[model samples]
Target: ENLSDVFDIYAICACCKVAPTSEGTKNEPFSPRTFRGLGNKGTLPWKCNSVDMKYFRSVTTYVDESKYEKLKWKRERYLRMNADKLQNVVVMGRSNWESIPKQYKPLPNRINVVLSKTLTKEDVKEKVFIIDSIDDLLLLLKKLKYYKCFIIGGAQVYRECLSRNLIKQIYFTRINGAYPCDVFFPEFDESEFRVTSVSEVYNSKGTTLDFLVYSKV
Candidate 1:
């Protein structure tokens, strides 16, 4: 059986305030500030402080502190809840994969897949799986016989999956305002998806965010 029918892609990202710079340095990552779905009421709500904006320029400017916090909590909770039920496959670009905190590593029974031509098997060892294309990766997932799959990634991978129409579900947290960004979510047709449910929650630090679950029809 083709696992693509059963696989779901969940994305977590902040809405951009301004257009992302085409050029970025080590301290800055490439972020394109683009908003998708103009007429659609599905917007991310957020508010931020100037101090926080300086450090986290991209995510802070547009993200509502309360909402952003809630989103983070939702991501964690979702991960924990699905830790056992679904095959936890962490598919991401090389740089984004490395950006994960060390404390988050060693998720037992979860396989990390990296989409990069640069990473050698020796570099990632058994902890990471490498793939050349999205189709190739999906094919591999079919071979593994997973019932559900989640994709955590930066902008590139998210857009790729969405464009391919391979995402069965998406978890979007919309921040209120906007900020600088190098990458942004592309426009999606409302006819293609429907919101299954929405929940509001508080993070460990007491920040509030909204969780919106969408299913492709």
Candidate 2:
């Protein structure tokens, strides 16, 4: 089944890159070549993808200790602010889902979806839904009657969604300066979308980050 027109798709991720490291021990730094070659317009490669970018909410104080809590807050806030009148759906890789602290499991008023080939029925239980392939995933979202779905990921999942043109809006939080991170966002063409807003905020860590929102043109 085709996804319902009533549904909206979203992708969320952090924006920033690390400088070249003297040794390869740490994750290799993100090179501009990867993004530039992809023909991405945004300063970072992930901006290259045409999905809408939403900003991460202020959780600077909790960034170090409550990373999962901060992420969960961002997800819940986005759903509350955007999903109006429709059920909310969260799409993430199995590992991403598993990484969430057990205390935050079974997120309320939203559907939890994990995409993976290795997830077991016992692994997810009743609170989690597992599906394979992007097409099948969308079909499942339609069957569930969700109004909007979020494709939340570290990197690979973002690329998969963008490659399939499955995302319609992207919510991004661009942290000023650089940080240590192994995963990355997808590179996409900016000619395909319009920027709605770019809001800035400072975290407790003193890093300035912008909440950028984009819509498909």
Candidate 3:
């Protein structure tokens, strides 16, 4: 494959239930002004959407052939970085980092970047990076080449990246049915992004969900 420097950035935003807490009968919802509404009490409204979870795991961990194909590039430095070293990346917030089960910490097989204002590189183990901001993360990405980078979320992270116009694509798992939530997946202008593909409704444990991919228009 040809050496190309134009690597694109993308996002995987939760896509559902952006309603206000006024509609909620529970504690005062975390401010609506912050996120667009998906999670409540630090977790998703529904339990174990295993199918979607597996889909996310697959999407983030797998790198396509083109991204990791043999490199005949003339640069000697390029040889130091081999196809076997290439992995897709997942950029996420601190809590999102903590939310992953301890056994699956760092989301195996992918390069995990946990963005936090208070965390240091020593705070994490190998293969994981602790960074403070999106700008810093972009700089890091520029320093390293990945097959793909996904701005995986909690509410604030998705909203911040979207507002900055940094997300080139969005992968959403839209689950059918009412879900109570305080935090949300940020909404973007559809006119600026068109649906690339949508998976047929996948039913699991009597719940229905669909995977949709959208790219910049």
Best by TM-score: 3
Q: TM per model? A: 0.60, 0.68, 0.80
Candidate number achieving the greatest lDDT relative to the actual structure? 3
| Residue 166, model 1: Cα distance from true site in angstroms | 0.5
lDDT-based ranking: 3, 2, 1
Candidate 1's residue-wise lDDT over 16-75, tens digit each?
334334566512333332333111122222334332223222221222333334534544
Q: Rank the candidates by TM-score, best first.
A: 3, 2, 1
What are the per-model C-alpha RMSD values against the true structure?
11.9, 10.7, 5.5
The CA-based lDDT of model 3 is what? 0.71
Question: How many backbone clashes does every candidate have?
Answer: 22, 16, 4
Off by over 4 Å in 1: 1-3, 8-86, 106-109, 176-178, 201-207
TM-score of 1: 0.60
lDDT of every predicted structure (CA atoms): 0.52, 0.56, 0.71
Cα deviation of 143 in candidate 3 (Å)?
Answer: 1.3
Candidate 2 lDDT, 103-211, residue by residue in tens? 6565445567888888778855558788886777866754554445777664677787777666678776655554444455667877766898777564534554566
> Candidate 3 residues 43-151, lDDT tens each?
7777567887888888888777664433223233444563357788798888888888889986888888988988776756656888888888877866675677787
As a whole number from 0 to 100, the lDDT of residue 105 in candidate 2 is 65
| Superposition error at 204 for model 1 (Å) | 7.2
